[PDB]
């Protein structure tokens, strides 16, 4: 009879995981302040990692990786990619990004303007996007003056907007791909076989952020064609793979998924020495949400990594069961839907 506590009531993924653990009859849920637990479904902010692994006679596991925020924050991700030799500034699968602190507060304002003027003089596309982790507040403009003034009005990041995205037909519309990745206590990287394409229901207009932002909330609130092409503006891999074969004469695995698996390995292997719990007094696993963008030339770009991701409604049951199987029952055995991304430890 293993024990676990729940410290994030708003986690839809681990509410189901907690439900599944109780349904096995071999997991008992304790009070959220009870220290004699085997598993902690911890809170998002200020998780007390320092109090873990100090309970004699208890193997303790937590559903977050300490230090993983370096990958799951806008400014942190840009700094990590530029400063890590494993990724380098010449990283070909990440958009050219810059960390811009507001003037009311290192900073890369002059570096950003130097590259901006090169595109203006070079007759190239010079449209950038400003965003931050404190958003639901995103500005897309071709003028650098508007972008810098908007930030001054928390830390923001300015990266290149992909002016030539892959557009699904019929619709001539934008989309993004969300992949769920589970890393266990042994730092095995498991990629969920099922992804989702969060598609825009409005035609892409390169000359209004409804057709430019693929966020589900912005589509269900500001788009008048919500649910027209696919249910909930969510196209799954089976339909998308068929479309690629019919339209582009290629498969999802070859054209896109190979680059996605490469990006996931590169990011997680880079921070492995900093966050691994191989020889630590407690063990960690974490579910990640990777969001990608595909251009018209079938090149995959990494946009952001989510440290506390949700899941598609259809895929909640399968993914949450997979979390129990490989991340929880692997440490606490009871009485594949993932693709293992092999790597060197």
């Amino acid at each position: 009879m293993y024990t676990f506590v729940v410290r994030d009531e708003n986690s839809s993924v681990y509410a189901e995981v907690s439900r599944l653990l109780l349904a096995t009859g071999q997991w008992k849920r304790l009070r959220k302040d009870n220290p004699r637990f085997n598993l902690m479904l911890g809170e998002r902010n200020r998780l007390p990692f320092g109090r873990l692994g100090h309970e004699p006679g208890l193997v303790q596991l937590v559903n977050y990786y300490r230090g993983a925020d370096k990958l799951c924050r806008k400014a942190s991700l840009v700094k990590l990619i530029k400063t890590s030799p494993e990724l380098s500034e010449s990283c070909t699968w990440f958009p050219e990004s810059y960390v811009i602190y507001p003037t009311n507060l290192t900073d890369e304002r002059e570096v950003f303007l130097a590259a901006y003027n090169r595109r203006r003089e070079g007759r190239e596309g010079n449209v950038w996007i400003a965003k931050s982790s404190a958003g639901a507040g995103i500005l897309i403009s071709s003028e650098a003056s508007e972008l810098l003034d908007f930030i001054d009005e928390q830390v923001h990041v300015i990266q290149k907007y992909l002016e030539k995205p892959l557009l699904l037909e019929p619709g001539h519309r934008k989309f993004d791909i969300r992949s769920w990745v589970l890393v266990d206590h042994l730092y095995n990287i498991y990629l969920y076989r099922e992804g989702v394409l969060r598609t825009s229901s409005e035609p892409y207009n390169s000359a209004d952020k409804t057709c430019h932002l693929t966020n589900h909330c912005i589509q269900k609130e500001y788009s008048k064609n919500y649910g027209r092409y696919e249910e909930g503006n969510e196209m799954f891999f089976e339909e998308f793979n068929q479309y690629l074969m019919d339209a582009l004469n290629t498969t999802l695995e070859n054209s896109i998924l190979l680059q996605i698996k490469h990006i996931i390995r590169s990011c997680l292997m880079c921070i492995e020495p900093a966050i691994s719990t191989k020889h630590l007094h407690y063990q960690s696993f974490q579910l990640f949400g990777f969001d990608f963008m595909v251009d018209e030339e079938l090149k995959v770009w990494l946009i952001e990594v989510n440290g506390a991701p949700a899941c598609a409604q259809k895929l909640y049951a399968e993914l949450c069961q997979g979390i129990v199987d490989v991340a929880i029952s692997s440490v606490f055995p009871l009485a594949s839907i993932f693709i293992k991304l092999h790597h060197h430890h």
Binding site: P48, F49, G50, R51, G53, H54, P56, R66, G67, P273, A274, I275, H279, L280, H281
Partner: protein
């Protein structure tokens, strides 16, 4: 030559002190009767080992140590132990009833009645010193005497020896060997009143020593003897520079200079390697790179914490055995390219290295195997604040209900000292977060 006086308070301090002075005699070749054949200057001398041992006209080398305990049972072991001839009765101070795991009893009730006696005995050893560096204080956080009487002693030492340095070897409470439930109370109370009187404190969590003994020595249920022999090895590595010829950490002042840039943050993390079971007939001797790499594994630290999620302010490497500087630098260069070692922006990213050619000494018949080379790393990392966080949390749980508080109030302590001590710890936790977190 400048002398150092060791003070052992409570059961943990006395028993650890007994283990350390046993190890010192083996390292310096001092027989249990106090005779040291290698010492050619009979009855005197200003050698490096004279900082810890005084000399009599008969050639006996007497430790510069004072043992204090409010209960006679533990020190009576020293009076009839193997090294009973080392000490004279003036060095051993015993009460009759202990502090009963009560900080207030050790600090106020019983401490007031014996503090003058201890200081007078300390004054006797100080009068034998031409120039006194200061004191090394061994005690536990959780015991009533180790927490209560130590804080009173540290206050008085700052009065009578204001220019002298004071260093601590403190035993952090661990439930696997703990004897009281109010140990979180005593630990915080003694930390609050000693914080401004201690220049450098080496915390040793009994949990870490317990697991190292279980993991690396194959001891199923380690005892205090198993724990103290390992602890004395770490203490010996820390104090070896004061007792042998060298240029790093040559006086107590240099410890604060090399490890404590901010006075309140004076709790360096100690990591020791290698710990090899003596029951292994043959073990592959670890290289300089392997033992140096092990200094960054939490499983070898004296306090379990993750330095990767903190920042370093200073780092000292203390090697004993067949170690040359070329191999140390080769190990350090490789470690930087593989480990997460972040320093604060206002400190250099470097290592102060000390090498003593004599390999570590193991007590015959002990649990630790002889090794060709060993290293103790002293790093001032903000990650050691995790021990404060755990300690403060347990304090908060009990104090919110005022559990066991009546025992302290009944000894004359005011309830406000609890909150005053807790607020000081809250400020201490804030100081660590400001330094090591962006």
């Amino acid at each position: 030559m400048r002398e150092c006086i060791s003070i052992h308070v409570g059961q943990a301090g006395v028993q650890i002190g007994n283990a350390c002075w046993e190890l010192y005699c083996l390292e310096h070749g001092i027989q249990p009767d106090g005779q040291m054949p290698s010492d050619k200057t009979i009855g005197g001398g200003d050698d490096s080992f004279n900082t810890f041992f005084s000399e009599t006209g008969a050639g006996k080398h007497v430790p510069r140590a004072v043992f204090v305990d409010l209960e006679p049972t533990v020190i009576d072991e020293v009076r009839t132990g193997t090294y009973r001839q080392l000490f004279h009765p003036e060095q051993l101070i015993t009460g009759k009833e202990d502090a009963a795991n009560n900080y207030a009893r050790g600090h106020y009730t019983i401490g007031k009645e014996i503090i003058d006696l201890v200081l007078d005995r300390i004054r006797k050893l100080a009068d034998q010193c031409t120039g006194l560096q200061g004191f090394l204080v061994f005690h536990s956080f959780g015991g009533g005497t180790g927490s209560g009487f130590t804080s009173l002693l540290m206050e008085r030492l700052s009065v009578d020896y204001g220019k002298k340095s004071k260093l601590e070897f403190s035993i952090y409470p661990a439930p696997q060997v703990s004897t009281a439930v109010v140990e979180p109370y005593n630990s915080i109370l003694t930390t609050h009143t000693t914080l401004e009187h201690s220049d450098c404190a080496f915390m040793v969590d009994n949990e870490a020593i317990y697991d190292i003994c279980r993991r690396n020595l194959d001891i199923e249920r380690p005892t205090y003897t198993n724990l103290n022999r390992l602890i004395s090895q770490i203490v010996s590595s820390i104090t070896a520079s004061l007792r042998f010829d060298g240029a790093l950490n040559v006086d107590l002042t240099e410890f604060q200079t090399n490890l404590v840039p901010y006075p309140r943050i004076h709790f360096p993390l100690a990591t020791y390697a290698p710990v090899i079971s003596a029951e292994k007939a043959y073990h592959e001797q670890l290289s300089v790179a392997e033992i140096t790499n092990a200094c960054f594994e939490p499983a070898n630290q004296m306090v379990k914490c993750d330095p990767r999620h903190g920042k370093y302010m200073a780092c000292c490497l203390l090697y004993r055995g067949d170690v040359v500087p070329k191999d140390v630098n080769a190990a350090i260069a490789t470690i930087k390219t593989k480990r997460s070692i972040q320093f604060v922006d206002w400190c250099p990213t470097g290592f102060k290295v000390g090498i003593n050619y004599q390999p570590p000494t193991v007590v015959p018949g002990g649990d630790l195997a002889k090794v060709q080379r060993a290293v103790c790393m002293l790093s001032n990392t903000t990650a050691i604040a995790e021990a404060w966080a755990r300690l403060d949390h347990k304090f908060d749980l009990m104090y919110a209900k005022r559990a066991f508080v009546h025992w302290y109030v009944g000894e004359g302590m005011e309830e406000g000292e609890f909150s005053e001590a807790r607020e000081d710890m809250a400020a201490l936790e804030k100081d660590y977060e400001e330094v090591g977190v962006d």
